[PDB]
Structure formats: C-alpha cells, structure tokens
Amino acid sequence: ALKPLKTWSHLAGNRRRPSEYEVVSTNLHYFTDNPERPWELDSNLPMQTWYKKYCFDSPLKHDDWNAFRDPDQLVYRTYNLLQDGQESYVQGLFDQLNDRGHDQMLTREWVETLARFYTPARYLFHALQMGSVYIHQIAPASTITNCATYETADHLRWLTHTAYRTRELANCYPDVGFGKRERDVWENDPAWQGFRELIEKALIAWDWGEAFTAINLVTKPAVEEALLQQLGSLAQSEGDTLLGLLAQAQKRDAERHRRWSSALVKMALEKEGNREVLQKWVAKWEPLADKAIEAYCSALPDGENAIVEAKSASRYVRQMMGL
Amino acid sequence: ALKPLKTWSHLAGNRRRPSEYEVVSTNLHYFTDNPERPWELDSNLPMQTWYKKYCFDSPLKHDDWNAFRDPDQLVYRTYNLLQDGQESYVQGLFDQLNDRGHDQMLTREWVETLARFYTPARYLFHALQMGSVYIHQIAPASTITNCATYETADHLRWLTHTAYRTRELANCYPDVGFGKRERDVWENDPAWQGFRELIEKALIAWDWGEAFTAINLVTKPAVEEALLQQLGSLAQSEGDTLLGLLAQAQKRDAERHRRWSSALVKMALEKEGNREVLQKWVAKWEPLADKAIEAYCSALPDGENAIVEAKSASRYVRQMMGL
Amino acid sequence: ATFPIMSNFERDFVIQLVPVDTEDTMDQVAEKCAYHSINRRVHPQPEKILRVRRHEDGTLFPRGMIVSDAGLRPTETLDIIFMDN
Amino acid sequence: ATFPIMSNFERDFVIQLVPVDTEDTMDQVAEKCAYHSINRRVHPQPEKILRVRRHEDGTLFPRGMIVSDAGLRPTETLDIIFMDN
Amino acid sequence: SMLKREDWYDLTRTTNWTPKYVTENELFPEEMSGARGISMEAWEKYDEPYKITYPEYVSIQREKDSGAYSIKAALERDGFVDRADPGWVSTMQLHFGAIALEEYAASTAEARMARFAKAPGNRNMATFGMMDENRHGQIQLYFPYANVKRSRKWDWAHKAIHTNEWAAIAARSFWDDMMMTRDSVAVSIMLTFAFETGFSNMQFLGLAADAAEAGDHTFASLISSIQTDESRHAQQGGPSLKILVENGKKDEAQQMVDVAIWRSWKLFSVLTGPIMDYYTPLESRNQSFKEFMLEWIVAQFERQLLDLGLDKPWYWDQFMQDLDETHHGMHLGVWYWRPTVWWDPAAGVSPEEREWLEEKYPGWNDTWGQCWDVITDNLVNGKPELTVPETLPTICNMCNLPIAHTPGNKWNVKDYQLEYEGRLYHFGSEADRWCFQIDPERYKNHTNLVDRFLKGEIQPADLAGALMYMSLEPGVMGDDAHDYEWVKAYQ
Amino acid sequence: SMLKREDWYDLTRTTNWTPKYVTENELFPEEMSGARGISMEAWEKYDEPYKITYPEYVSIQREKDSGAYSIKAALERDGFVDRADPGWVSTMQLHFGAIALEEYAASTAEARMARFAKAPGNRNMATFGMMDENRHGQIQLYFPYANVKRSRKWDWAHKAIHTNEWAAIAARSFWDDMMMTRDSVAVSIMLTFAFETGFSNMQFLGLAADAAEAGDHTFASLISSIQTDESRHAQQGGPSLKILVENGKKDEAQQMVDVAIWRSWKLFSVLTGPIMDYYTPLESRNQSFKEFMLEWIVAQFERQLLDLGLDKPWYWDQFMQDLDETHHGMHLGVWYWRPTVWWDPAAGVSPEEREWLEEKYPGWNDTWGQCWDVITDNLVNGKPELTVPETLPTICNMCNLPIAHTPGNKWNVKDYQLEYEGRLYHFGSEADRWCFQIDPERYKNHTNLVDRFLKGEIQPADLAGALMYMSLEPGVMGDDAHDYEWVKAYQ
Numbered sequence A, B: 001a002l003k004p005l006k007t008w009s010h011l012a013g014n015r016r017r018p019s020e021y022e023v024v025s026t027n028l029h030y031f032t033d034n035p036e037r038p039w040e041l042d043s044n045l046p047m048q049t050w051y052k053k054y055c056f057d058s059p060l061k062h063d064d065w066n067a068f069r070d071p072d073q074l075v076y077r078t079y080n081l082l083q084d085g086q087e088s089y090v091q092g093l094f095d096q097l098n099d100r101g102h103d104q105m106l107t108r109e110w111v112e113t114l115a116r117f118y119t120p121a122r123y124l125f126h127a128l129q130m131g132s133v134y135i136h137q138i139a140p141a142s143t144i145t146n147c148a149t150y151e152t153a154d155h156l157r158w159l160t161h162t163a164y165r166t167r168e169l170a171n172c173y174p175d176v177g178f179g180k181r182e183r184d185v186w187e188n189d190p191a192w193q194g195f196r197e198l199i200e201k202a203l204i205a206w207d208w209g210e211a212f213t214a215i216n217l218v219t220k221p222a223v224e225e226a227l228l229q230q231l232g233s234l235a236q237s238e239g240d241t242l243l244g245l246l247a248q249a250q251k252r253d254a255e256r257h258r259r260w261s262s263a264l265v266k267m268a269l270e271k272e273g274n275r276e277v278l279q280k281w282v283a284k285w286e287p288l289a290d291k292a293i294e295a296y297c298s299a300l301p302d303g304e305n306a307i308v309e310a311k312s313a314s315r316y317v318r319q320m321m322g323l
Numbered sequence C, D: 001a002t003f004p005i006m007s008n009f010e011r012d013f014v015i016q017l018v019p020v021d022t023e024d025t026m027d028q029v030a031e032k033c034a035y036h037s038i039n040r041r042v043h044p045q046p047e048k049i050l051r052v053r054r055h056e057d058g059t060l061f062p063r064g065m066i067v068s069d070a071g072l073r074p075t076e077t078l079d080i081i082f083m084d085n
Numbered sequence E, F: 001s002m003l004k005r006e007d008w009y010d011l012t013r014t015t016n017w018t019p020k021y022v023t024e025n026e027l028f029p030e031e032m033s034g035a036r037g038i039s040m041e042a043w044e045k046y047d048e049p050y051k052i053t054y055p056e057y058v059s060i061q062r063e064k065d066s067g068a069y070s071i072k073a074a075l076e077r078d079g080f081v082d083r084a085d086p087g088w089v090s091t092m093q094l095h096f097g098a099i100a101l102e103e104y105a106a107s108t109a110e111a112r113m114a115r116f117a118k119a120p121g122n123r124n125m126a127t128f129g130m131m132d133e134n135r136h137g138q139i140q141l142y143f144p145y146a147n148v149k150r151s152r153k154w155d156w157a158h159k160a161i162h163t164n165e166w167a168a169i170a171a172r173s174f175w176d177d178m179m180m181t182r183d184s185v186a187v188s189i190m191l192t193f194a195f196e197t198g199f200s201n202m203q204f205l206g207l208a209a210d211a212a213e214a215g216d217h218t219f220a221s222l223i224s225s226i227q228t229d230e231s232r233h234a235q236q237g238g239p240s241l242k243i244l245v246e247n248g249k250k251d252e253a254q255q256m257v258d259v260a261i262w263r264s265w266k267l268f269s270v271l272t273g274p275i276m277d278y279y280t281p282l283e284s285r286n287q288s289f290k291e292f293m294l295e296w297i298v299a300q301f302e303r304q305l306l307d308l309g310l311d312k313p314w315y316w317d318q319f320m321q322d323l324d325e326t327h328h329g330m331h332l333g334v335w336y337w338r339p340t341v342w343w344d345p346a347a348g349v350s351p352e353e354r355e356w357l358e359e360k361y362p363g364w365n366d367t368w369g370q371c372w373d374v375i376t377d378n379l380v381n382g383k384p385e386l387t388v389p390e391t392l393p394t395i396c397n398m399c400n401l402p403i404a405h406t407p408g409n410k411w412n413v414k415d416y417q418l419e420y421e422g423r424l425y426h427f428g429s430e431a432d433r434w435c436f437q438i439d440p441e442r443y444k445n446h447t448n449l450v451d452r453f454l455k456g457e458i459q460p461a462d463l464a465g466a467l468m469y470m471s472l473e474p475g476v477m478g479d480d481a482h483d484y485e486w487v488k489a490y491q
C-alpha cells in the first residue's frame, strides 16, 4: 500500500516544508495535462483551438511554468489583509479631507485639469482590469494566473477610487459635468488618444506572452508613470493633496505588479531565445507607449519635462529585468 | 425553584433585549455594595477612607449611577475595531509621507516651532492619561469607569504618536535636540506653564466629580482647542500636512470623550443641585484654563486670534451641556 | 473473433461491457453475460432459459444463431432476458 | 446560658461551630459535638469515652465540670477526643 | 464624511466606450462574448441585484477568512477526523477531490465574463467572482492538507482532477462543458444561474448542516463560509437571461438552461444523492435525497423560470420520476466498483437502513433491494469476490457515468443509443442523448473510458491496467466504508 | 517607511517631570504610590522586559477577539453544554462566578499603577493591563451569558461577587487584600508577580488543556486566549522587586511576597485543587493537583526568587507538606456544605476514583477515605440527611475558608487561635495567623460569616436565614454533581 505523505505528492522532496503559498497555489491548472485536447470535450471546439493557439503555441517557452513563484507570495487570505489595511488608509484620507473641506480649497484651473486629466482614467483603469483579467485566463500555470488575479482586483480598486472621487467632485462642482463628460473626453480628447489606441490594440493581443508583455511590461509602465507619477506630483504642487496621496497609494499596487512581471521575465530568461522574443514584442509596442505618453503629458503644465521623465522611468522598469 | 432568566437578573424587565454593551458593562463595581466598608477588610484602612471620602461623599449626587450609558456604547471588542481602523489610517500617513520625504520639505522656522510647540506635548498628553486613569478608579459605576478606561488608551495613543514623530523629527534634524529638550521646555518655557500648572493642580483633585470636571470638562477642552485645533490649522498653513492630519485624527478621540462627558452631565442634571455643583467647580478651574490658553497661544503666530478662538470654542463645549 | 457488446441483463441495474466471440451462439453470449450478473446481483432462475434480443428494436435472436450472422454493430446493446422457449 | 464554642472532633477533618449551654457538663458538651460528627464523618467508638480538652494548651476537663467553671472564651476551640477514663 | 454607496455606485460600471482603433467584434470576439446580435446599448440594461464595492469586499472577506482559519486552528489538535464516522470521512474525501480544483477553475470561468461580457455590471461582478473562486479553491486545499499524514486519499484533494479516474473525467466533463468552454453570456446562464443558484447554493447549506450534525465543526464552518460568498456572483445569469428574453432570444436562452440543468442533475445524482441516502448515519438523516430535491431545488427552479418568462424544460416530468431512481443506481455502481474511486464507499443497507429506504422510496426492497440481497448473501456465505467486478460498466457518452436504473421486480434499465457518422454512442437517458443531438460538434470525438479501453488506449488491456491508467493503487482504491461491519446483522 | 520599534520606544515612557505648582508627595501620595523613600530617578531604572506599543496592541488584540468570538458563534448551536460531564459544567459555573467581576476589578488595580507609579514604564504597561482586564472581565461575562436560559446558576457569573455567599467573601477577601487596597508598588509585587506570574498563568494553561480534553472548545478557546494576554502585564512586579532590593528594601519586598504567595495558595486550594482531583473525570486526569503544583508552580517560584535576590518564604516546607492535604479538606468542606455554593459539587469518590487518589496520595483512604466511608454507608443505607450539615464550620479569619485538615487514622486538625484586643480570632494555618500579626490594623475589625452569625447580623439566626443572607435559594443551591450515580457502585 501507498504511504501517507508529508505534503502534496507534487511537492514531496523539496527539503524545506512547503509554505501556505505553495500549498494553495501550485500545479492547479488541469487544461495543460493534454495539450492536444485541453478540455474534456470534442477537440475541435473553438475554445480547444483558442487555448492551443494562444497558450500552447506561444513563442515564449519553458519546460515547467509551474515552477513560477510570486516573490510577494500572495494568497487570497493575505491579499485581503494587505488590501484591507491599505483601504483603511485611503478611505481614511477620503473621510478626513472631506471633513476638512479639501475639495472647496482647489482652484478653478485645477478643477478644470481634474475633469480633463484625472476623471476619465476610469476607462483606462477599467481597460487594464480587462487586460489583466485576460492574462489570468490564458496563462500556462496557476501561479502565473494568480498574480494576474490579484492585479485585476487592484485595477478594480483604482477604478473604484476614481468612481468615488468622481461623485465627490461632481457634488462639489456641479457645473463641470464630472461623471457625465468622461466618455467623450476618453473618446475625443487628443491627450487621451495615445493611450486609448495603445490599450484598444493591446486588448486584442491574445497570445499569453504577448498579452503579458503588451499589458504588464509596456502599457502599465506607461500608464503608471503618466497618471500616477506625473499627474500626482503635479496634483501635490497645485494643492491637491488628496490626489497626490491617492496616486502614491495606488503606485504601491503598481510596484507589486512590477515585482512579479520582473520575476516572470527572470524565469523566462533561463531558456535560450526568450529574451529575443520578449525584446521583439517590446519593440512592436514601445512606439505606441511613447505616443500615449506624448499625447497625454505634452498637454500638462511643464509638458515636455513630464514626457522626458515618464519615458525614461518606464523604460527603466524593463532595463532592470535585463531587456 | 428559581427559573432560568432571559438575561442577567439585574437587567430583567427592560422590554428591549439587552445589548452586548449592557451585558458586559453594567453593575460591575462591587465596592459600592457597602458604603460603610467598601473592601472586604478592616474599615479603617487608608483605601477604605479614600473611597468613602472621594467617591461616596462627593457633592455630585445620583441615586443610581449604574443607569449611565455611553452614547458610543463602547466595549473592548469594538474599541479595538474602531481604533485598529483609525490606526491603519495614521500609520498609513506616517509610512507614506516619510516615503515622500515630507519632513525634508519643512522650513527651518517651522522646525523650530515644532520643537517648541509640538514635541513637548508628550508630557501634557501623558498627564491627561494619568488624569483619565484616575477617573477610572474612583468613579461610582462601571459604565462611567469604562468610558474613562477607553479615553485613557486614547491619551496613550496620542503620547505614542508624539513619541514616534519625535524620533522621525530627531532623525531628520539631529541638531535641534528633539527628544532631549522637551522636559526643559515643558518645565521652563513660559508658553507651557499655563498648562503645566492647570494639569499639575487638576491631577490632585481627588473627588471623583471634581476630577471629571477639572479633567474632562475643563482641561481637556482647553488642551484640545490649543494643541489640536490651533496648532493643527497652523501646521497646515505652514506646510506641515502630516501634523494637520494627525491632529484632526486625534480630535476624533476628543469628540468622543466630549460625547460621554456631555451624557454624564446630562444625567447629573436630573438631580436638583448638581448644575450648581458642576458650575461651581468650573468657576474654580476656568481661570487656570484661560491662563493655559493665553500662555500657549499668545506665543504662536497670529497669537491673539488663536486665544479668542480657543477660549470660545472650549467654552462652547460646556455651554452645549447646559452649564 | 472477439467482439464487444453491452449487456443489459434482466433484473440487474446496470448495462455492462461484455466481450464475446463472433463464433458464439446466442446461448454462449448469454452465458458470458450471466457470469457478470448471476450470483452477483441477479438470482439464478434455473426453471428458465436465457435469451438474447437487440435492445434498440426488440428483435429476438434464436438460441442457435451465431454473433457473426446477427448483424450487430460493435458495442451494440443486448437485452439478456429470462424465458421458457 | 447559651455559649458558642468551636468543636475539633477527633478524626473529623473540620472544626465546627457548636452552641452549648453554660450549665452543661463536659459530657453534655461532648454529646452536643458528636451530633455534628458521629455518623456523619466519624465512626462511633462505643468501647470509648468522649472527653473535652482545651485546644490551645491541651488541658483536660473532668467529665463532670460545667462550662460555667471551665474559664472559656466565647468561641474557644475544644478538642473532643476518645478515651477510656 | 463618506458618500452613501447608492450615490456613486453606477460610476463603477459606467465603463463602456465605442472602440475606434480596433473594431467592436475584434475587442469582443463573438466566440468569447456571446453578445448574440444584441447591441452594447441593450447589454447596458444589465443590472445586478446584489451590489458590492472593492472596499466592502476586502473588508467583509478578511472577516470571513479570519473566523474560518481561526476555527480550523483551534480544533486542529483535537483531531476529530480520527474518530468521525467513516461514512463522514469518506464524504469529505469525495468532496475535496471532486471540488477543490473545479472551484479554482471556476475563477477562469469568471475571468471569461470579466473580459468578454458586454454588460459592464457583469464585468465587475465577475471580477469579485474571480476573487471568490480563488478563495474557494485555495481554502478547499488548505483544509484537507491538514490530513495528508493520515492517508494518501487526502492527496486526492489536489490530484483527482489531474487523473483519468472515472469520477474525475465525469467532473471535467461537466465543468468544461458548463463554464470553461462557453462564451461569456453562456457561462453566466449555465454556471451561475443553472448550477450555482440552482444547485450548489442549497446543497452547500445542507452539507454544513450535516457536517454539524456529525460533530465536525471545522468542516461545517468551512462550508458554511464558502456558502455566504455564493449569491454575490451566483446572481449573474439572471440579468443575462432577462436581456436575452427581452430581445429576440427566448429559445437560445431556454435551450442553455435545459442543457445546464440536466447536466448538473446528473453530476449531483452521483456526488450528493448517494451521500444523503447512504453515507449519512441513519439517525442523522433529516430528510431523503428525493425530499431535499423537491423542497429545496425543484420548486425554486419553477419559481425562477416562471419569473424570468421561461418554461419548465421538456424533460421535467421525467426528472421528477428519476428522483426515485437515478441515485440508487449511481450508489450501487460506486459501491460495487469501489476500488475505482478514491474514498471508501458506505453500503448503507443494514436492516434498519433498509426500512428507512423503504419509507422514503416505496418499492426499494422489491427493486434495489434484490441486488443487495445477492451482494449480502455472498458476504455472509464467504464469497466476497462476487461483490467486486470483473468488467467495466457501460458509460454514458454525455455525462460519463454508468448507465443504470431500476433493477429487480420492476426492471427498467434502458440505453438511449445513437449512431452518428459511423460510430455508436451510448446514453443514460433521453436528455443525455438530446444534449449531444442539439450540438454534436461539441461532443463528437470525445471518448469515454470504455471507448478508450476498447480502442487499445489502456494497456495492459485488463482491469489492473485500467487501475494504472486511472492512477489508482492500493492505498487509495476504495473499499467498504465500515469494513463490512453491517454484514454481522445477517451473520 | 516606518521606524523600528527599538529606535523610539524609550520616548513613550520618558514622561517624568519635576512638579512645581504642587509637590511631589502631593502628586504621588505615598499611600497610593508606595515609592518608599526611593527617588524618582531610581524608579526610572524600571525596565519592563516585554515591550509593546499602542498600534501593536489594538491590532494584535482585534485579532484575538475576532477568533475567540468567531469560535463561540460557530459552536453556539451545537450546545455542547447540554451534554458535557456535569463535573465540567460545574467547573465552568464556579470559574465564571469567582472570576468575571474580580478580573474586571483588576482593571482598577492596574489603574492604580497607571496613575500612581513613579516608574514611567510601569505607568504605561499598567495602561495596557488596564485594557487587558477590561477584556477579561467583559468576555468572561459575554460567554456564560449564552447559558442564562439553561439554569439560574449562570446568572452567578454576574451576581456572585455581589453576594455574601461564603466563597464570594473569600474571593473579595483575597483580591481586595492583594490589589484593591494596596499602593502601586505593592500591587505590582503582590498581584502581577506573586499571583499572575506565580499562579494564574500556569493555571489558565492547564485549564484550557482540560477544557479541550472535555471536548469543550468554546471554553478552551476562551481561556487560552485570555492566557496569551497575561505575561504582558504580569511582568510588572519583577522590575519593582529589583528596585526595592537594589535599594534599601529586601525585607519589605520579602514580606509582601510571603503574604501574597500564602494568600494565593489558600484560594487556589479551594478553587482549583478540588477541580483537578475530583471534578475532572478519572480518565481525563493528566496529573494530580500535588504534581501540578510541584512541576508548574513551585520550582518556578524558587527560580524567580533566587534570580531576584530573594529567599524562599519561612513557610515553604509547610507549604510543601500541605500539598498532600489542604485541598482534600477544602473539597470535603465544599461537598459536605454543597447547598451553600452556586455550582453542583462532584464527590469524586467512586472505587476507581479512590484508588487513583491512593496512588497520588498514599494514606488517602486511611485518612480522607474514612469520612467518605461514613458519608457513603449513609447514602447506601437511605440516610441522606446525615450527609448535609446542621451547623456552620469554623472559618479562618484571614482566608475566610473553613479550618480543616487531615482526618481519620492520622488526625491532625489544628486551630491557630489569637486573642487580640479582647477578641478571639481563628486561623487555618500558622501562615494565615502570621499574615494578621504582621499588620493587624488591616484585618482587625473584619468579620467572617461565623462572626456575623454569632453577632446577630444574620436573621432569622438559623440555617435558612444564612441561606437568605448569602442570596441562595432553591435553583442555585448546590447538590451532588452526578446526582449520586456513583453510590450504585456500593449499592
């Protein structure tokens, strides 16, 4: 008879006793057991085809993607411990600056800037949420999928801050059209069309590795530097302390997404040929990001410096992984 | 035989099913069962005498102090739910403004003001902690005692913020003597001697009702208006956003202490003669508070307006209870 | 000569895989089926005779017909019923 | 004439309150004590005689002495012991 | 101060825009979205009746895991599991193997609606759903993990769905059909409406009640906590159904419901039915599996279907009838073929048990009772070898479960065969066959275990070979749950 | 970023200043502070070895109540209490009545050090202590409250310490002496060092173990959670003791320790000793009350006392000896006078129990066993009336407990009498008498129940009168825990 094991069969002989993280996150996708028939149905079903094409046939290759490990090691339970903490802080900010009358103290000029540069981000943030939720459902291993799950909730987290602050702003400045105008700004403002195009196009890159690169390595770095870093330093110097803080709080999420993307890239580099693959995908998309950052930041105050700073900080992210 | 009851014997026939609050807070002091011998020992013991004199013989009188009810209805369990929340927010502030380099951005002049007007509050706040912890141990009913318990932890909460920010300030401005100099400022600065005297004297008012009045109705209103309201609005306009926020966060605690003091006063007014008793105690102490506020605020910028504002806001607290 | 069929034995609860031979008589089919049902979940009926009918349409095969001539589809489902003729 | 004493009955585990009379003999003290110890937690010893000694210093009272003359402090503790004289 | 939720909620799901740089069909491919010719503007009427927002979620859910993980740690050392009724231990081992990884797969299913649904409210609710099944997957792994040193069967909580063991194939067969391989709107109908709202919600309620009756509070708490998450994403299919009916599609909507309810029912008849009526000790039996189905599952569907403008499925009466039968079959199948599963099946046919079975199901002893008479006599008479099988049973090509039914004095076992493109398929019911016929390209080249056996895919091509093929060895292969203790009642 | 705690902690307790507007003796009255001629500067060396700060506290403690309240709610419906061994139910009823309000009183005791101690570290640690006993008081009320509809005895969790029932007087007698009526330094020695560190810490550990062995996880969790709070304020007396010894006061320090250990021991012998050795079912008995005392309480004091520069108390050997005896007495007292308490006492003298008692305590049957022989014969022979009392027992004037000891073939019951200012006092031991003699003004005019009875304070002046005086009526008055079931062993 087979003996009871110390740990899951797929983890035995690891020398170190498996962590909670390893216990609940590893080797969970079963569609990768039969690359020829992922799903327990006819093998010509459109979904069969979708997974064969966009997961299995990706040029980004590894013999064992299940070896991937979040460096932050997040599980649901600790994701909600972290994020409840960070939300007590942000909801705290909202409560107490309202109480203070913070929105009343902003200048008309700044209010106008918010309507143009800040509010419509609900579309860009929802579209990252879609972006990251797609990586989830197409990635080759559960630990990859998980990082993308928690990142998708952050993206919703940001959409949610923006939706909230948008009422408060409408409540305080009823004539501006906060909440009504954002769609036409997103759709028609030249400052947004760089990003809108970047994201619409990256949203239809189905290959898992090209989705990871286009969303996590290229679009995100560019959205983050432009909307969190640049608009936030601006916010602070124009007297918006709430958005300077809010934005820095969301950049905590972004730095975590960066740490796992970097770990993934690091793992992909163990295999000959992947750097070239990733570098190629970056070159295809970088020009759309450059355009995004140009069209957005150039319309800001001190526009050209914001472009130089955002360009180089977002490139830096990729440089640090060895790309 | 006696039948099992629906609730505690001392709560039966209340019509409404007793709350958690009523279940864990009411009718718990036993020293009031024998006003002639509070403690199960010889009746001439000094502590026997202390309680007879300072609890039982207080001029502030009621037939049933056990009827008192916190309007906030706090119990340990919900005290720590509230305060963990408010601490995620404040510790959040500390983390993120450090990260921002907030202490580096303050002007030398403002740093000098902090060393003089802000840091030494660790003494004043510790002395309120002593003040409130004394009300705890001498008050005539557990629900009174409890309010004073949770208020004493707030007082420690504030001492703790100040102790913390004091290292950070020392770390950032090593030449100023933050952390080393506060005792001599507390002890010798004319700006502090108004308060120092108020608090040293109120700290030896042993009668429970006179302790409640001197600490909760008089000293606190005056410390709060001067150190939270006035120094905080000042902080904000001088570019200290951390202290403007910190101070407003602590004023949440103060508003809660006010709500229970007001409820106590309201209850004391059911009895003929108590208003006069309370009014008399206020008149004895108000002049020391006036002095406290004068010596502190006059040394601030725009000094005289701070004195008029602090005086009248603290009087307002007492006016609202009907005093 | 080995040929799969699905045996729906009378008074059992389950249809089952039963490999027979193409040279077998119905009688010999029935005997290879009973092995998997009689004294497992069905009580012998020795007063009776085991007959073979095609499940889809109720056709009754003579005892002596061989599998070879019955026109069965591999895996075809067969009723194995108790009769006296 | 009712006078409190504390009865430390031999072979019991507990000293107890026993109201006696000032006119009682030691014998009658002992009998009012046994009531609270014999056949409750102590086995009778009918071969024996119940005697009264003062607990503090071991003085033995004659059977016939009355409480009145014994010089007891109210509540004084008394040994009630089994003897043959 | 804070806003009331009511005041700003709609802005969280005002997230639709008119793409320009790519086309609508390119951003929302029909095969993933299933928008069905209905416009973005019409999908925007989608309105989830239970609303929630990010800060509420992370807060409320930290509270749930805190309690559940705390209960677990407090009771860990008492090791209730070492003295639980073995019908119960078995119940848990079956639950964990069949469910843990399917729950985790359900997050991808939710991710399907999160990216691909044209209703913005659907897309956000699905994000919380995604979070939810990440929770159900993770915790339903953390829990049985406490028990790995007790038996290798607990390893199956992770390993099951990775195997070709028949129950696992049946499981994947159901889930992949329902949620992994359908468009977004279809997932919302077939999974969240038909299965989650239709079955698994009331089931998890009952299973927590049972666990508590068994004196297993760790597990009662586990299940009961999962269940409080259900309706928040379970709600998703209703609004979809409304939109489809209000526009030109009552039939498409209907047909998905018919399909998902039948496929769910079948899985439920092998996984829950046997448990209720046979593993649960007699005196813990609150009600029968047929009763449970009538009170808690069936009247509810009728309500829902009526309220949405839909009808009762064509098979409804047959469904009604099969409540007296299917699961008895499924149980007998599982017990008889017990070395083929990874838990120990409970026979549950002692004298007392059998008169209960006859109260709840008149006719039981003069149908199901017969097979069990023979099993019993054999174990009394020292012939245990006649109570284990020497062949495979015929598997349904739709539900991947044995084709069984009423035996004994009212024999009624039927096979609903179909020849399609030169191949003979087998079906356990008229409905299973009909599922295939309406959409044969979806099922056509799949092969069940029997197919595989017959095709030479299992080697060696005998019973010990199929054991290896199914990843089963001594240690995990099931035997009688109570080690045949109930046989003594007959000598 | 955040500072490390190490870096700023000292600033939290740098809170001493030189008063000017009032005098040091006025702000710190000696009768409350007990500074003892030792200067502010010397009190400032006080250094608590376990450090904590406000945000850590409120965070960690929200986590503890979450779990404990969650365990409670999860197990509430199973109502374990209705099928627990009645020796256990009794154990809980005694615990709640004797402890709930004394725990809450302990917060005032902590408040004593918070205001009045000259050591700033002491003043802050006491604030957390204050918080802690607010928690212990509150939760130890919330818990038994679940059980009010089951019996009026549960009402005693609130009512006990409000009554003149003898156990309650004994309780107040101890606590008021230890913590409610002493100066700050003295509270820190006598309560946190001698009692909390000395007894209640290891006791609560053992009691949680026992609760778990009884299959009562609600209560095991309750107790086990309280216990994790203990050392954080229990630590307080050690630094005080150091300061007193390092300056001119080894004797004052010594004498308080001697007093607090003896007074604690006595309470512990009626409240814990009987439980371990008689209410706990035989087969749950991990070890004897004497063994427990030797392993977990006594070697620890020796360690501590040696490490602080102090000696073993004068009575130590006597203490050693009395471990064989005192609690057997206390148990017999409680059982015999059972209508005078608010729980049902467990006899615990079945044949099996008695041979256990004889293994753990050689001589038991030929001393303690005798009284129990007579009790038993009487219940066998239909004379139950001879097993309940017709008088009061003599109460010790220090510990307010009956004066009892070794009966039977090695009779040794002594009374340590004292005449002082025209009044005769009674004492249960040499130590109880000595406690009074060193500080007679503290105890002099107190009266125990017997005193009161004899003075005409109890009216009517008979047994039914003392029942009323003690607030006891049928419903709460104790009887034999197992309703005399163990008598059948003898017929």
Ligand SMILES: [Fe+3]
Binding pocket: E103, E106, E132, E133, E136, E226
């Ligand atoms: Fe789920």
Ligand SMILES: [Fe+3]
Binding pocket: E106, E133, E196, E230, E233, E234
């Ligand atoms: Fe679900």
Ligand SMILES: [Fe+3]
Binding pocket: F103, F106, F132, F133, F136, F226
């Ligand atoms: Fe405590």
Ligand SMILES: [Fe+3]
Binding pocket: F106, F133, F196, F230, F233, F234
């Ligand atoms: Fe304590």
Ligand SMILES: [O-]
Binding pocket: E132, E133, E136, E226, E229, E230
């Ligand atoms: O769920």
Ligand SMILES: [O-]
Binding pocket: F132, F133, F136, F226, F229, F230
């Ligand atoms: O404690």
